[PDB]
Amino acid sequence: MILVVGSLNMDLVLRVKRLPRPGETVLGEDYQTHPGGKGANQAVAIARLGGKVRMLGRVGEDPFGQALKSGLAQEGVDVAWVLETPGPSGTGFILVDPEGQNQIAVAPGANARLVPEDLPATAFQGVGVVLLQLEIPLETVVRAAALGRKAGARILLNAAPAHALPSEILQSVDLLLVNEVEAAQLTEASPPRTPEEALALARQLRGRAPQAQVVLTLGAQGAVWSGTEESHFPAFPVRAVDTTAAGDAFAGALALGLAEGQNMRAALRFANAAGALATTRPGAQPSLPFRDEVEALLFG
């Protein structure tokens, strides 16, 4: 059983011919609404992947409030903890060029009012894995770590994007899960070209975070694991059609893979299969695989 302590955003997606330069105005097409948020994506991905999960966060009392809420439950995810707030929900401002080069910005609204005291013990009860991204406040992440620990959950932090973390928040975490961009401003060195220039950046985190097994997500090249050992996990070779649900469909899948009680090697190859088959379909949440394909891909 998993607890996502993470963000709920309805996204406004607006196609342009080329992305605007600074100071430049461009006309695009009519925007569309799809549920966004690393947190929500992660819960759906987990349910899709055949697993019991619950969202802890906060939706608005605008129209999109109930859509975030609804769609999440239709996937088969317990939303009992999805606490309603005034103002809008969360909203993301997505500009996609016809190639997939896109530009995302997120209005937190209801996500940035999910407070350190909103977190109630019973959200965390019976939970095997607490999954944290940073599309919710920070003290709500220091606090969500501590309560997941008190409930006997493994703390998986998906840091998306990167900040400066004191070793306060890495002797607290059971697994750190990052992509190239994040690994780069969590160390202040050259972003990883090879799996070697990564497996290094791994020990340069595992350095800060002794008993936190570190996972680093490469794209096209997969991911490396520097913990009980040092390893590289080949990506699955498939047509990079769309990379919405990046270190994200991986994150949900890893969280679910460890919850369901798979060894680390298998949950990583599960997360690779997951966030590869994410790329072969267009869009955020419709791309996020069912257990059917992943379990079928992972034998053929």
Residues with catalytic roles: 248
Nearest Cα to Cα of residue 175 among 261, 255, 276: 255
Number of residues that bind ligand ADP (CB under 6 A): 26
Taking CB under 6 A as the criterion, the residue among 138, 240, 266, 296 binding ligand ADP is 240
CB of 50 to Mg ion, least distance (A): 20
Taking CB under 8 A as the criterion, the residue among 204, 243, 262, 280 binding its own copies is 243
Amino acid at 114: L
Taking CB under 6 A as the criterion, the residue among 138, 238, 266, 296 binding ligand ADP is 238
Taking CB under 8 A as the criterion, the residue among 89, 91, 140, 287 binding its own copies is 91
DSSP 3-state of 200? helix
Query: Could you say whether residue 107 binds its own copies (CB under 8 A)?
Result: yes
Site string for ligand ADP, 192-231 (x = CB under 6 A): -------------------------xxxx-xx--------
CA distance 279 to 273: 10
Amino acid at 195: P
Residue 272 marked in a binding site: yes
- Cβ-Cβ contacts under 8 Å for 211 (sequence gap 6 or more): 171, 174
CB of 228 to Mg ion, least distance (A): 31
CB of 289 to its own copies, least distance (A): 18
146 binds, among Mg ion, its own copies, ligand ADP, none (CB under 5 to 8 A by kind): none
Q: Work out the end-to-end distance of the chain between its first and last CA atoms, rounded to an integer number of angstroms.
A: 28
Q: Residue 209 belongs to what H/E stretch?
A: none
71 φ/ψ angles, rounded to the nearest 5 degrees: -45, -40
The partner residues of 4 in beta bridges, in order of sequence, read 55, 131
